[PDB]
């Protein structure tokens, strides 16, 4: 679990969005596993606007942060799950690191701000949904 709180927006994994997220929907994209909902309170986070390929992510299944080198956002095949059929997930970045299903939502940050959130994983890999291209989050 986990979310990014920026301005009057809450960014979550689309597969973990609540009834309230859907009732206050701003934008969602099944191909990216992202959903953004509106909030009444002003958020705590800054979004990176950069091309970093190194950063640190929070891994809830270890209660620890780990440094990672990750690939640029791209279209990556993701196996079928209870949430989605087998498909290509876009804007996904992979890295070697521990993750388990419940780790989705963990933030990936570089020196410039929030890069994205944990969205996929398996066998010593971890995938992050990028949010750096969503320029409207800052306005
Ligand atoms: C950190 S998720 C994870 C980690 C390790 N083994 C498995 C997983 C689960 C996982 O990859 N997905 C299930 C939930 C929806 C995901 C998606 N974006 O399509 C895919
Ligand atoms: Zn950066």
Tab-separated table of N, CA and C and ligand atoms in Angstrom:
chain	number	residue	atom	x	y	z
A	1	UNK	N	0.828	-1.206	0.000
A	1	UNK	CA	0.000	0.000	0.000
A	1	UNK	C	0.864	1.258	0.000
A	2	UNK	N	0.268	2.380	-0.373
A	2	UNK	CA	0.958	3.658	-0.372
A	2	UNK	C	0.463	4.617	-1.437
A	3	UNK	N	0.668	5.910	-1.215
A	3	UNK	CA	0.248	6.914	-2.173
A	3	UNK	C	1.216	8.091	-2.203
A	4	UNK	N	1.145	8.912	-3.270
A	4	UNK	CA	1.845	10.185	-3.358
A	4	UNK	C	0.796	11.264	-3.123
A	5	UNK	N	1.116	12.253	-2.301
A	5	UNK	CA	0.212	13.371	-2.038
A	5	UNK	C	0.853	14.643	-2.528
A	6	UNK	N	0.396	15.197	-3.653
A	6	UNK	CA	0.989	16.401	-4.240
A	6	UNK	C	-0.137	17.380	-4.540
A	7	UNK	N	-0.064	18.621	-4.020
A	7	UNK	CA	-1.125	19.597	-4.235
A	7	UNK	C	-2.457	19.055	-3.757
A	8	UNK	N	-3.505	19.145	-4.605
A	8	UNK	CA	-4.785	18.577	-4.213
A	8	UNK	C	-5.007	17.238	-4.880
A	9	UNK	N	-3.932	16.436	-5.013
A	9	UNK	CA	-4.034	15.147	-5.688
A	9	UNK	C	-3.448	14.048	-4.825
A	10	UNK	N	-3.992	12.827	-5.000
A	10	UNK	CA	-3.542	11.603	-4.358
A	10	UNK	C	-3.307	10.613	-5.503
A	11	UNK	N	-2.068	10.135	-5.654
A	11	UNK	CA	-1.697	9.178	-6.708
A	11	UNK	C	-1.576	7.813	-6.067
A	12	UNK	N	-2.294	6.829	-6.593
A	12	UNK	CA	-2.251	5.480	-6.020
A	12	UNK	C	-2.125	4.469	-7.160
A	13	UNK	N	-1.801	3.210	-6.824
A	13	UNK	CA	-1.875	2.128	-7.820
A	13	UNK	C	-3.358	1.983	-8.176
A	14	UNK	N	-3.687	1.927	-9.471
A	14	UNK	CA	-5.107	1.843	-9.856
A	14	UNK	C	-5.759	0.571	-9.254
A	15	UNK	N	-5.001	-0.532	-9.160
A	15	UNK	CA	-5.564	-1.793	-8.646
A	15	UNK	C	-5.838	-1.766	-7.154
A	16	UNK	N	-5.307	-0.750	-6.432
A	16	UNK	CA	-5.537	-0.578	-5.001
A	16	UNK	C	-6.447	0.639	-4.675
A	17	UNK	N	-6.955	1.337	-5.701
A	17	UNK	CA	-7.797	2.520	-5.440
A	17	UNK	C	-9.044	2.143	-4.649
A	18	UNK	N	-9.442	3.013	-3.733
A	18	UNK	CA	-10.612	2.783	-2.870
A	18	UNK	C	-11.888	3.311	-3.501
A	19	UNK	N	-13.066	3.051	-2.863
A	19	UNK	CA	-14.328	3.633	-3.334
A	19	UNK	C	-14.233	5.169	-3.358
A	20	UNK	N	-13.575	5.753	-2.335
A	20	UNK	CA	-13.411	7.189	-2.278
A	20	UNK	C	-12.532	7.729	-3.386
A	21	UNK	N	-11.449	7.014	-3.756
A	21	UNK	CA	-10.605	7.448	-4.890
A	21	UNK	C	-11.445	7.522	-6.176
A	22	UNK	N	-12.252	6.484	-6.430
A	22	UNK	CA	-13.099	6.469	-7.623
A	22	UNK	C	-14.207	7.541	-7.580
A	23	UNK	N	-14.712	7.887	-6.378
A	23	UNK	CA	-15.743	8.943	-6.232
A	23	UNK	C	-15.163	10.355	-6.433
A	24	UNK	N	-13.850	10.503	-6.237
A	24	UNK	CA	-13.170	11.770	-6.464
A	24	UNK	C	-12.131	11.627	-7.610
A	25	UNK	N	-12.454	10.826	-8.631
A	25	UNK	CA	-11.543	10.540	-9.731
A	25	UNK	C	-11.145	11.780	-10.540
A	26	UNK	N	-9.826	11.937	-10.791
A	26	UNK	CA	-9.298	12.988	-11.665
A	26	UNK	C	-8.858	12.342	-13.007
A	27	UNK	N	-8.132	11.244	-12.910
A	27	UNK	CA	-7.581	10.555	-14.079
A	27	UNK	C	-7.174	9.142	-13.688
A	28	UNK	N	-7.342	8.187	-14.597
A	28	UNK	CA	-6.859	6.834	-14.360
A	28	UNK	C	-6.428	6.194	-15.675
A	29	UNK	N	-5.464	5.289	-15.611
A	29	UNK	CA	-4.974	4.614	-16.794
A	29	UNK	C	-4.624	3.186	-16.399
A	30	UNK	N	-5.452	2.221	-16.834
A	30	UNK	CA	-5.253	0.807	-16.554
A	30	UNK	C	-3.901	0.334	-17.128
A	31	UNK	N	-3.507	0.885	-18.302
A	31	UNK	CA	-2.234	0.456	-18.923
A	31	UNK	C	-1.029	0.903	-18.111
A	32	UNK	N	-1.184	1.893	-17.211
A	32	UNK	CA	-0.065	2.344	-16.368
A	32	UNK	C	-0.214	1.879	-14.898
A	33	UNK	N	-1.377	1.277	-14.543
A	33	UNK	CA	-1.721	0.923	-13.169
A	33	UNK	C	-1.714	2.181	-12.297
A	34	UNK	N	-2.163	3.346	-12.832
A	34	UNK	CA	-2.233	4.557	-11.990
A	34	UNK	C	-3.645	5.093	-11.897
A	35	UNK	N	-3.931	5.738	-10.763
A	35	UNK	CA	-5.199	6.434	-10.591
A	35	UNK	C	-4.864	7.631	-9.738
A	36	UNK	N	-5.436	8.783	-10.090
A	36	UNK	CA	-5.249	10.024	-9.324
A	36	UNK	C	-6.621	10.506	-8.887
A	37	UNK	N	-6.747	10.842	-7.613
A	37	UNK	CA	-8.014	11.338	-7.080
A	37	UNK	C	-7.757	12.711	-6.439
A	38	UNK	N	-8.829	13.495	-6.261
A	38	UNK	CA	-8.671	14.824	-5.648
A	38	UNK	C	-8.761	14.747	-4.137
A	39	UNK	N	-8.080	15.682	-3.453
A	39	UNK	CA	-8.085	15.719	-1.985
A	39	UNK	C	-8.506	17.116	-1.531
A	40	UNK	N	-8.985	17.231	-0.295
A	40	UNK	CA	-9.346	18.537	0.264
A	40	UNK	C	-8.118	19.182	0.924
A	41	UNK	N	-7.240	18.367	1.510
A	41	UNK	CA	-6.043	18.861	2.172
A	41	UNK	C	-4.871	18.956	1.171
A	42	UNK	N	-3.938	19.875	1.410
A	42	UNK	CA	-2.767	20.050	0.542
A	42	UNK	C	-1.742	18.976	0.854
A	43	UNK	N	-1.187	18.346	-0.169
A	43	UNK	CA	-0.255	17.241	0.026
A	43	UNK	C	1.167	17.560	0.432
A	44	UNK	N	1.844	16.557	1.014
A	44	UNK	CA	3.195	16.601	1.555
A	44	UNK	C	4.369	16.441	0.520
A	45	UNK	N	4.154	15.824	-0.660
A	45	UNK	CA	5.218	15.473	-1.637
A	45	UNK	C	5.520	16.480	-2.818
A	46	UNK	N	6.768	16.390	-3.458
A	46	UNK	CA	7.375	17.100	-4.629
A	46	UNK	C	7.629	16.036	-5.727
A	47	UNK	N	7.294	16.308	-6.996
A	47	UNK	CA	7.523	15.327	-8.070
A	47	UNK	C	8.836	15.675	-8.782
A	48	UNK	N	9.688	14.696	-9.007
A	48	UNK	CA	10.923	14.887	-9.769
A	48	UNK	C	10.565	15.160	-11.235
A	49	UNK	N	11.310	16.051	-11.877
A	49	UNK	CA	11.156	16.337	-13.307
A	49	UNK	C	12.573	16.194	-13.837
A	50	UNK	N	12.950	14.971	-14.169
A	50	UNK	CA	14.333	14.637	-14.481
A	50	UNK	C	14.416	13.318	-15.273
A	51	UNK	N	15.670	12.904	-15.593
A	51	UNK	CA	15.877	11.616	-16.240
A	51	UNK	C	16.749	10.701	-15.392
A	52	UNK	N	16.696	10.829	-14.055
A	52	UNK	CA	17.459	9.932	-13.168
A	52	UNK	C	17.104	8.492	-13.426
A	53	UNK	N	18.097	7.618	-13.353
A	53	UNK	CA	17.900	6.181	-13.431
A	53	UNK	C	18.444	5.475	-12.201
A	54	UNK	N	18.721	6.236	-11.118
A	54	UNK	CA	19.072	5.701	-9.806
A	54	UNK	C	18.200	6.427	-8.775
A	55	UNK	N	17.914	5.736	-7.680
A	55	UNK	CA	17.106	6.337	-6.621
A	55	UNK	C	17.002	5.370	-5.464
A	56	UNK	N	16.052	5.629	-4.584
A	56	UNK	CA	15.853	4.806	-3.389
A	56	UNK	C	14.345	4.538	-3.299
A	57	UNK	N	13.949	3.284	-2.999
A	57	UNK	CA	12.526	2.992	-2.838
A	57	UNK	C	12.249	2.408	-1.466
A	58	UNK	N	10.995	2.573	-1.014
A	58	UNK	CA	10.595	1.999	0.255
A	58	UNK	C	9.953	0.644	0.007
A	59	UNK	N	10.435	-0.361	0.737
A	59	UNK	CA	9.976	-1.749	0.599
A	59	UNK	C	9.270	-2.148	1.918
A	60	UNK	N	7.917	-2.108	1.924
A	60	UNK	CA	7.195	-2.374	3.161
A	60	UNK	C	7.405	-3.762	3.706
A	61	UNK	N	7.599	-4.762	2.835
A	61	UNK	CA	7.829	-6.155	3.262
A	61	UNK	C	9.182	-6.378	3.949
A	62	UNK	N	10.029	-5.346	3.997
A	62	UNK	CA	11.288	-5.389	4.735
A	62	UNK	C	11.364	-4.203	5.741
A	63	UNK	N	10.374	-3.301	5.754
A	63	UNK	CA	10.418	-2.063	6.547
A	63	UNK	C	11.738	-1.305	6.292
A	64	UNK	N	12.163	-1.250	5.033
A	64	UNK	CA	13.493	-0.678	4.734
A	64	UNK	C	13.477	0.014	3.405
A	65	UNK	N	14.391	0.958	3.230
A	65	UNK	CA	14.591	1.613	1.948
A	65	UNK	C	15.827	0.968	1.282
A	66	UNK	N	15.760	0.789	-0.037
A	66	UNK	CA	16.885	0.193	-0.774
A	66	UNK	C	17.270	1.093	-1.963
A	67	UNK	N	18.565	1.217	-2.254
A	67	UNK	CA	18.983	1.964	-3.462
A	67	UNK	C	18.769	1.059	-4.706
A	68	UNK	N	18.465	1.668	-5.880
A	68	UNK	CA	18.193	0.882	-7.076
A	68	UNK	C	18.703	1.597	-8.300
A	69	UNK	N	19.050	0.799	-9.334
A	69	UNK	CA	19.316	1.328	-10.674
A	69	UNK	C	18.121	0.809	-11.467
A	70	UNK	N	17.408	1.669	-12.191
A	70	UNK	CA	16.184	1.246	-12.884
A	70	UNK	C	16.168	1.644	-14.341
A	71	UNK	N	15.500	0.851	-15.163
A	71	UNK	CA	15.427	1.145	-16.581
A	71	UNK	C	14.499	2.347	-16.860
A	72	UNK	N	14.644	2.965	-18.038
A	72	UNK	CA	13.808	4.098	-18.416
A	72	UNK	C	12.371	3.615	-18.577
A	73	UNK	N	11.387	4.508	-18.408
A	73	UNK	CA	9.978	4.071	-18.523
A	73	UNK	C	9.701	3.427	-19.870
A	74	UNK	N	9.093	2.234	-19.844
A	74	UNK	CA	8.844	1.528	-21.097
A	74	UNK	C	7.647	0.588	-21.031
A	75	UNK	N	7.335	-0.086	-22.164
A	75	UNK	CA	6.213	-1.026	-22.266
A	75	UNK	C	6.751	-2.386	-21.908
A	76	UNK	N	6.218	-2.983	-20.830
A	76	UNK	CA	6.726	-4.243	-20.309
A	76	UNK	C	5.621	-5.208	-20.110
A	77	UNK	N	5.797	-6.459	-20.579
A	77	UNK	CA	4.780	-7.473	-20.406
A	77	UNK	C	4.646	-7.844	-18.940
A	78	UNK	N	3.389	-7.838	-18.447
A	78	UNK	CA	3.092	-8.209	-17.070
A	78	UNK	C	2.100	-9.375	-17.111
A	79	UNK	N	2.421	-10.453	-16.395
A	79	UNK	CA	1.594	-11.663	-16.334
A	79	UNK	C	0.219	-11.344	-15.753
A	80	UNK	N	-0.793	-12.192	-16.079
A	80	UNK	CA	-2.138	-12.001	-15.549
A	80	UNK	C	-2.131	-12.099	-14.033
A	81	UNK	N	-2.983	-11.310	-13.382
A	81	UNK	CA	-3.129	-11.354	-11.920
A	81	UNK	C	-4.635	-11.317	-11.628
A	82	UNK	N	-5.020	-11.271	-10.347
A	82	UNK	CA	-6.443	-11.148	-10.034
A	82	UNK	C	-7.009	-9.762	-10.436
A	83	UNK	N	-6.121	-8.783	-10.676
A	83	UNK	CA	-6.476	-7.422	-10.987
A	83	UNK	C	-6.493	-7.101	-12.459
A	84	UNK	N	-5.672	-7.784	-13.252
A	84	UNK	CA	-5.590	-7.470	-14.683
A	84	UNK	C	-5.365	-8.716	-15.492
A	85	UNK	N	-5.822	-8.708	-16.748
A	85	UNK	CA	-5.426	-9.800	-17.655
A	85	UNK	C	-3.942	-9.626	-18.015
A	86	UNK	N	-3.342	-10.632	-18.683
A	86	UNK	CA	-1.963	-10.542	-19.187
A	86	UNK	C	-1.937	-9.366	-20.196
A	87	UNK	N	-0.962	-8.453	-20.046
A	87	UNK	CA	-0.976	-7.235	-20.887
A	87	UNK	C	0.384	-6.533	-20.879
A	88	UNK	N	0.567	-5.497	-21.707
A	88	UNK	CA	1.775	-4.668	-21.596
A	88	UNK	C	1.425	-3.494	-20.714
A	89	UNK	N	2.212	-3.260	-19.682
A	89	UNK	CA	2.022	-2.106	-18.815
A	89	UNK	C	3.007	-1.051	-19.319
A	90	UNK	N	2.516	0.133	-19.619
A	90	UNK	CA	3.360	1.218	-20.106
A	90	UNK	C	3.922	2.079	-18.976
A	91	UNK	N	4.990	2.846	-19.289
A	91	UNK	CA	5.630	3.798	-18.355
A	91	UNK	C	6.149	3.044	-17.110
A	92	UNK	N	6.615	1.787	-17.302
A	92	UNK	CA	7.083	0.961	-16.197
A	92	UNK	C	8.604	0.926	-16.227
A	93	UNK	N	9.220	1.003	-15.044
A	93	UNK	CA	10.684	0.975	-14.909
A	93	UNK	C	11.068	-0.205	-14.031
A	94	UNK	N	11.999	-1.081	-14.477
A	94	UNK	CA	12.387	-2.237	-13.656
A	94	UNK	C	13.735	-2.058	-13.006
A	95	UNK	N	13.917	-2.750	-11.899
A	95	UNK	CA	15.169	-2.726	-11.192
A	95	UNK	C	15.291	-4.022	-10.424
A	96	UNK	N	16.529	-4.368	-10.068
A	96	UNK	CA	16.784	-5.515	-9.211
A	96	UNK	C	16.616	-5.032	-7.778
A	97	UNK	N	15.727	-5.699	-7.058
A	97	UNK	CA	15.407	-5.395	-5.680
A	97	UNK	C	14.274	-6.284	-5.212
A	98	UNK	N	14.197	-6.489	-3.906
A	98	UNK	CA	13.134	-7.277	-3.350
A	98	UNK	C	11.792	-6.588	-3.417
A	99	UNK	N	10.752	-7.358	-3.721
A	99	UNK	CA	9.372	-6.887	-3.611
A	99	UNK	C	8.450	-8.095	-3.517
A	100	UNK	N	7.276	-7.877	-2.906
A	100	UNK	CA	6.165	-8.803	-2.727
A	100	UNK	C	4.878	-8.039	-3.083
A	101	UNK	N	3.766	-8.731	-3.394
A	101	UNK	CA	2.553	-7.997	-3.874
A	101	UNK	C	2.103	-6.758	-3.046
A	102	UNK	N	2.119	-6.900	-1.731
A	102	UNK	CA	1.773	-5.832	-0.795
A	102	UNK	C	2.705	-4.643	-0.811
A	103	UNK	N	3.842	-4.749	-1.526
A	103	UNK	CA	4.772	-3.623	-1.600
A	103	UNK	C	4.345	-2.553	-2.596
A	104	UNK	N	3.263	-2.803	-3.371
A	104	UNK	CA	2.792	-1.763	-4.300
A	104	UNK	C	2.449	-0.489	-3.557
A	105	UNK	N	2.757	0.653	-4.146
A	105	UNK	CA	2.495	1.934	-3.477
A	105	UNK	C	3.718	2.540	-2.821
A	106	UNK	N	4.761	1.730	-2.575
A	106	UNK	CA	6.011	2.249	-2.008
A	106	UNK	C	6.619	3.282	-2.944
A	107	UNK	N	7.080	4.386	-2.389
A	107	UNK	CA	7.610	5.471	-3.219
A	107	UNK	C	9.065	5.220	-3.646
A	108	UNK	N	9.365	5.583	-4.892
A	108	UNK	CA	10.732	5.612	-5.424
A	108	UNK	C	11.080	7.118	-5.522
A	109	UNK	N	12.238	7.536	-4.960
A	109	UNK	CA	12.640	8.933	-4.977
A	109	UNK	C	14.076	9.016	-5.438
A	110	UNK	N	14.392	10.095	-6.137
A	110	UNK	CA	15.774	10.432	-6.470
A	110	UNK	C	16.051	11.776	-5.738
A	111	UNK	N	17.222	12.387	-5.955
A	111	UNK	CA	17.524	13.682	-5.304
A	111	UNK	C	16.542	14.803	-5.699
A	112	UNK	N	15.761	14.630	-6.780
A	112	UNK	CA	14.874	15.710	-7.260
A	112	UNK	C	13.453	15.630	-6.771
A	113	UNK	N	13.081	14.489	-6.181
A	113	UNK	CA	11.721	14.330	-5.722
A	113	UNK	C	11.208	12.926	-5.998
A	114	UNK	N	9.904	12.782	-5.964
A	114	UNK	CA	9.250	11.523	-6.209
A	114	UNK	C	9.291	11.154	-7.697
A	115	UNK	N	9.730	9.937	-7.969
A	115	UNK	CA	9.863	9.426	-9.317
A	115	UNK	C	8.645	8.594	-9.712
A	116	UNK	N	8.227	7.723	-8.805
A	116	UNK	CA	7.092	6.845	-9.084
A	116	UNK	C	6.745	5.961	-7.903
A	117	UNK	N	5.879	4.964	-8.131
A	117	UNK	CA	5.486	4.052	-7.045
A	117	UNK	C	5.663	2.608	-7.467
A	118	UNK	N	5.913	1.696	-6.493
A	118	UNK	CA	6.014	0.267	-6.799
A	118	UNK	C	4.694	-0.217	-7.426
A	119	UNK	N	4.792	-0.982	-8.519
A	119	UNK	CA	3.601	-1.439	-9.218
A	119	UNK	C	3.686	-2.916	-9.629
A	120	UNK	N	4.903	-3.473	-9.820
A	120	UNK	CA	5.023	-4.907	-10.217
A	120	UNK	C	6.275	-5.511	-9.507
A	121	UNK	N	6.463	-6.816	-9.606
A	121	UNK	CA	7.675	-7.425	-9.107
A	121	UNK	C	7.722	-8.914	-9.311
A	122	UNK	N	8.772	-9.499	-8.776
A	122	UNK	CA	8.899	-10.951	-8.775
A	122	UNK	C	10.329	-11.379	-8.947
A	123	UNK	N	10.721	-12.446	-8.272
A	123	UNK	CA	12.030	-13.091	-8.374
A	123	UNK	C	13.229	-12.157	-8.282
A	124	UNK	N	13.223	-11.248	-7.302
A	124	UNK	CA	14.354	-10.340	-7.142
A	124	UNK	C	14.268	-9.140	-8.066
A	125	UNK	N	13.082	-8.889	-8.655
A	125	UNK	CA	12.845	-7.689	-9.448
A	125	UNK	C	11.801	-6.811	-8.768
A	126	UNK	N	11.822	-5.519	-9.114
A	126	UNK	CA	10.803	-4.600	-8.649
A	126	UNK	C	10.516	-3.601	-9.781
A	127	UNK	N	9.228	-3.364	-10.064
A	127	UNK	CA	8.854	-2.454	-11.144
A	127	UNK	C	8.133	-1.250	-10.575
A	128	UNK	N	8.415	-0.075	-11.133
A	128	UNK	CA	7.838	1.176	-10.638
A	128	UNK	C	7.080	1.886	-11.748
A	129	UNK	N	5.862	2.354	-11.429
A	129	UNK	CA	5.106	3.137	-12.360
A	129	UNK	C	5.669	4.562	-12.286
A	130	UNK	N	6.168	5.072	-13.425
A	130	UNK	CA	6.709	6.434	-13.449
A	130	UNK	C	5.578	7.459	-13.340
A	131	UNK	N	5.856	8.599	-12.663
A	131	UNK	CA	4.885	9.698	-12.626
A	131	UNK	C	5.530	11.011	-13.108
A	132	UNK	N	6.829	11.008	-13.488
A	132	UNK	CA	7.517	12.250	-13.839
A	132	UNK	C	6.991	12.922	-15.054
A	133	UNK	N	6.301	12.178	-15.955
A	133	UNK	CA	5.749	12.831	-17.146
A	133	UNK	C	4.407	13.527	-16.871
A	134	UNK	N	3.788	13.321	-15.691
A	134	UNK	CA	2.458	13.902	-15.402
A	134	UNK	C	2.656	15.325	-14.906
A	135	UNK	N	2.893	16.245	-15.856
A	135	UNK	CA	3.217	17.622	-15.471
A	135	UNK	C	2.119	18.341	-14.749
A	136	UNK	N	0.850	17.960	-15.052
A	136	UNK	CA	-0.315	18.574	-14.435
A	136	UNK	C	-0.421	18.322	-12.912
A	137	UNK	N	0.353	17.372	-12.361
A	137	UNK	CA	0.287	17.117	-10.911
A	137	UNK	C	0.712	18.339	-10.084
A	138	UNK	N	1.593	19.180	-10.663
A	138	UNK	CA	2.179	20.380	-10.059
A	138	UNK	C	1.392	21.644	-10.250
A	139	UNK	N	0.269	21.598	-10.964
A	139	UNK	CA	-0.522	22.795	-11.202
A	139	UNK	C	-1.966	22.545	-10.770
B	1	LIG	C1	5.342	-5.485	-6.031
B	1	LIG	S1	4.094	-6.441	-6.902
B	1	LIG	C2	4.741	-8.087	-6.908
B	1	LIG	C3	5.979	-8.388	-6.354
B	1	LIG	C4	6.398	-9.703	-6.385
B	1	LIG	N1	5.696	-10.695	-6.931
B	1	LIG	C5	4.508	-10.377	-7.452
B	1	LIG	C6	3.966	-9.107	-7.478
B	1	LIG	C7	2.568	-8.868	-8.001
B	1	LIG	C8	2.548	-8.108	-9.313
B	1	LIG	O1	3.569	-7.901	-9.947
B	1	LIG	N2	1.331	-7.744	-9.771
B	1	LIG	C9	0.060	-8.027	-9.084
B	1	LIG	C10	-0.716	-6.760	-8.791
B	1	LIG	C11	-0.885	-5.919	-10.062
B	1	LIG	C12	0.467	-5.661	-10.751
B	1	LIG	C13	0.284	-4.903	-12.055
B	1	LIG	N3	0.763	-3.676	-12.077
B	1	LIG	O2	-0.228	-5.445	-13.047
B	1	LIG	C14	1.208	-6.983	-11.018
B	2	LIG	ZN1	16.083	12.917	-10.430
